Every structure is written in structure tokens, then in C-alpha cells.
Amino acid sequence: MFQQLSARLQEAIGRLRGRGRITEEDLKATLREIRRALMDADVNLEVTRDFVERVREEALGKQVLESLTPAEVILATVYEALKEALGGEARLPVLKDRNLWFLVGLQGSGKTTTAAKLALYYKGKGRRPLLVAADTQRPAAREQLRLLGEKVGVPVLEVMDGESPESIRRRVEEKARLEARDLILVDTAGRLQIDEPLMGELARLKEVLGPDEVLLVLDAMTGQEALSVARAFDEKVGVTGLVLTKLDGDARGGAALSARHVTGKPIYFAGVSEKPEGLEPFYPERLAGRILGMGDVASLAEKVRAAELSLEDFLKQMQNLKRLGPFSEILGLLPGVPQGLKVDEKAIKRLEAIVLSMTPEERKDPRILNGSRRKRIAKGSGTSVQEVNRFIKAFEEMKALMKSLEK
């Protein structure tokens, strides 16, 4: 699981194996080693920060510097550390006599699939699920859920072209009553970007339908970008939990390890394969062990492994720079004011958002951008037509510089 981070925590735990009692200066290195592993895995900072500190702390209190098997103490420690960062105990939305959940996320995060696989899971534990295809614009989207429901053996209510939230409220809560369905899984609409109109319609649908839980589905392969999307949706709809998919395709895990601290919401289910049974209830203890090598199962990749710019890129390089701390020394040459921290966390999020509301094609070539677009983008994101146009120019220029310095 998370091969990079996994391999590295192990090299570190391992080097202490068979050495006998170690010295403090040895433990001080093992801690650095771990800190590196997390920082290179994109694990958030106060998370990495706290991870290490919780280790050094729990370790000493376990008589590390005086134990005969120091290695097995770091292992027991790094384990509980991971457990914590991942939520501690396995949680699962609490059930009732009547349940109505919302399934929100971007298009291509496995939302529609999850709906079905989630319906299938609970059916297997008694509940009488009802799936609702709530995208009033895309008939093709609804049809996909329809067939997924036929396969898992669950009923499906398809809304209608242009149906109003109140009409749906009725139709839905009427069919679940008559047919005795205690778990309603509503697959909202999903697109490749965050756009105001829909995020507004979704907000309203919630207001009207009154969901008991709102599960946000995030593709783990998208790294940090997943944590920005979490922010977009809680900020505008209200998420009650997470579902991390394509979790077997993430090599870092920085997103999953930081999701709890950064978003505050828990992880309920996580996909660990593309098999239907692949969507299993998330357990921190399991993921913890696996990361450290216990009870893990090799993944398709883990097996194959044992045998010009882009706006997306630009944003990321800034993200990676901020993370490498301040460059006091490089700034020691230029008499420019110390602490070029005009780049405060909050100033990057404005950009992280600008990109999120941009069309996928517009990110490939911001040039195509016209005025009517920036207007749009600026609205969806929560910024000014200026910040947007500015941000873009900053890119265009860096693109040309980046390009020139090649020839």
C-alpha cells in the first residue's frame, strides 16, 4: 500500500533490526529518516510534524533507548502513529430506520460506481436500498446507474429532464415508502470542474431532500488536488464524510494520510481494487499495518514493480516550493526584503480554486481563454476577473522562461 512511503518507513524500521540496544543519537536519526519519508510522500506538515513527535514520545516511554529489540518498538510506535493520522478507529456512518444519503464528487472519481457498489454492500447486510440517479441534465449518466443497479439487484429511480428538487423529493420519498426502502443512495450530478450554477442546484437539492449523510467521493490518485475539491464541496454543500477511490493507484498517500486533519471529515469507505467487493469499509489499523508490511496483499502495480508546461504543473511547482520552506539563503544575495511570504497559504488556495473552476481544456492551454470565460471562472472560484487574468499571465511568462532556458 503506498509503495513509496511503505518501502521507506520499512527501510528505517529495518536498519534498527538486529542491532541490539541502540543509542539516543541512533534514535535521533531514525526520527529524521521517518520525517523524510512523510515529507517526500506529500504528507501534510503539522501531520508529519505531529507524526514524528508522537513517535519519539511514545518510543522513549516504551524504554526504546534501553530495550533489547529497539526495532520492534519503533514498529509498534509508527504503527499507532499511522493509525491516528488515518482516523484512529474504524468508523462507519450510523444507521437508522430511514436513511437518505447524498453522493457528491467530480466526474471521474468513481462516484456513480461507488453508488452501486455501496448499494450492493449494504444490501448484503440486510438494508433495502434504493438508488436515485439525480442528474437532470445528463440522460447518459442516469442510464449508467440504471444498469449498475440492475446488475447489483437494487431498484433505481431516474429523475427527469429538468425536474425540480421538490418534485424529486416527493417521487423519491414515495417510492421508498411504498416499497419499504431503508437506505436511499442519491447519485448527484458530476462534472469535470466546479461550476457555480450546479453547485447551487446541488446546495438546493440538499436543502429540499434533507440528506442524513453527504459522502464526498475523491479519487486518491489526484494527490493534493483531492483535498482542494474537499474544500470546494464542504464550503458550498456540506460534506459529512469521505470515500477514497483508486486508492491502489496512489504511490504517496499524502492525501489519505492528511485527509482527517485537513478536511476534518472521516473516511468511511475506501476502494482497494476495481472488484465490486473492492469498496470495503475503511480501517486505519489495516492500512496502517499494510503500510508497514503486515498482512498486505501485493497490488497489480506493486507486482509489476517487484519484477512545454501546463497550468496544472505551474500551480503544483508553487505548491512544492512553499513546502520546501523559505529560501533565506538564496535571498541572502538579493537585497530584496526577507520573508518573500507574499505567498501565504491563503493566497495559494485562491489559485488552487481558480484552477478547479477552469475547464479541463482551458488548463491545457489558458491561451484560448477569452473575456467571457475569465468572468465565469472568477465567479465559480470566488475571486476577481483580475486575480484570474493575473494568475494566468504569471503562468504564460513562466512558461516562456521555462521554455527559453531549454534551448
Residue 31 labelled as part of a binding site: no
> Which helix (DSSP H) or strand (DSSP E) does residue 386 occupy?
helix 385-404
- Note down the domain range covering 383: 308-407
Residues 107 and 246 in one domain: yes
Residue 371 labelled as part of a binding site: no
CB neighbour burial string for 49-83, b if at least 16 within 10 angstroms, e if fewer: eebbebbbebbeebebeeeeebbebbbebbbbbbb
Residues 270 and 121 in one domain: yes
Q: Count of residues for the chain?
A: 407
Residue 341 labelled as part of a binding site: no
Residues 272 and 390 in one domain: no
Residues 219 and 349 in one domain: no
CB neighbour burial string for 89-106, b if at least 16 within 10 angstroms, e if fewer: ebeebeeeeebbbbbbbb
Q: What torsion, rounded to 10 degrees, do the Cα atoms 153, 155, 161, 165 define?
A: -130
- Domain termination residue (choose one: 274, 307, 340): 307
Residue 149 labelled as part of a binding site: no
From the list 241, 279, 306, 257, the residue with the least C-alpha distance to 48 is 257
Other C-beta atoms within 10 Å of 320: how many?
Answer: 11
The CATH number assigned to the domain holding 78 equals: 1.20.120.140
Residue 359 labelled as part of a binding site: no
Cell numbers at residue 376, please?
465565469
Residue 109 labelled as part of a binding site: yes
Residue found under cell 426502502: 181
Residue 265 labelled as part of a binding site: no
Method: X-ray
Residue found under cell 519503533: 74
Residues 168 and 229 in one domain: yes
What one-character-per-residue DSSP string does 104-163 give?
E--TTSSHHHHHHHHHHHHHTTT--EEEEE--SS-HHHHHHHHHHHHHHT--EEE--TT-
Count how many Cα atoms sit within 13 Å of the Cα of residue 163 in the half-sphere of its side chain. Answer: 21
Residue type, 359: T
Q: What are the contacts of 17-24 at 24+ separation with CB within 8 A?
A: 17/71, 18/71, 19/70, 19/71, 20/68, 21/65, 21/66, 21/67, 21/68, 21/70, 22/64, 22/65, 22/70, 23/65, 24/65
Task: Please state, in angstroms and as integers, the Cα–Cα distance from residue 238 to each residue in 88, 199, 212, 224, following that order.
Answer: 23, 11, 11, 20
* Strand, coil or helix: 72: helix
Q: What is d(CA 135, CA 110) in angstroms, rounded to the nearest whole number?
A: 15
Residue 162 labelled as part of a binding site: no
Residues 160 and 299 in one domain: no
E-state strands within 246-337: 267-271, 279-281
Q: What is d(CA 324, CA 333) in angstroms, rounded to the nearest whole number?
A: 19
Residue 248 labelled as part of a binding site: yes
Q: What is d(CA 370, CA 83) in angstroms, rounded to the nearest whole number?
A: 48
Q: What is d(CA 302, CA 298) in angstroms, rounded to the nearest whole number?
A: 5
Beta bridge partners of 320: none
Do residues 103 and 215 lie in contact, with contact meaning Cβ atoms separated by under 8 Å?
yes
Cell numbers at residue 71, please?
526495532
Residues 299 and 276 in one domain: no
E-state strands within 208-357: 213-219, 241-245, 267-271, 279-281
Q: What is d(CA 219, CA 250) in angstroms, rounded to the nearest whole number?
A: 9
Residues 242 and 129 in one domain: yes
Residues 198 and 327 in one domain: no
Residues 155 and 231 in one domain: yes
Q: What is d(CA 130, CA 156) in angstroms, rounded to the nearest whole number?
A: 6
Residue 332 labelled as part of a binding site: no
Residue 69 labelled as part of a binding site: no
Residue 110 labelled as part of a binding site: yes
CB neighbour burial string for 324-343, b if at least 16 within 10 angstroms, e if fewer: eeeeeeeeeeeeeeeeeeee
The CATH number assigned to the domain holding 343 equals: 1.10.260.30
* Strand, coil or helix: 103: strand
Q: In Å, what resolution does this model reach? A: 3.2
Residue 336 labelled as part of a binding site: no
Q: What is d(CA 255, CA 308) in angstroms, rounded to the nearest whole number?
A: 27
* 77 CA to centre of own chain: 25
Q: What torsion, rounded to 10 degrees, do the Cα atoms 47, 48, 50, 54 define?
A: 130
Q: What are the contacts of 44-48 at 24+ separation with CB within 8 A?
A: 44/254, 44/257, 44/258, 44/261, 44/262, 45/323, 46/261, 47/85, 47/257, 47/258, 47/261, 47/262
Residue found under cell 511570504: 341
Residues 228 and 321 in one domain: no
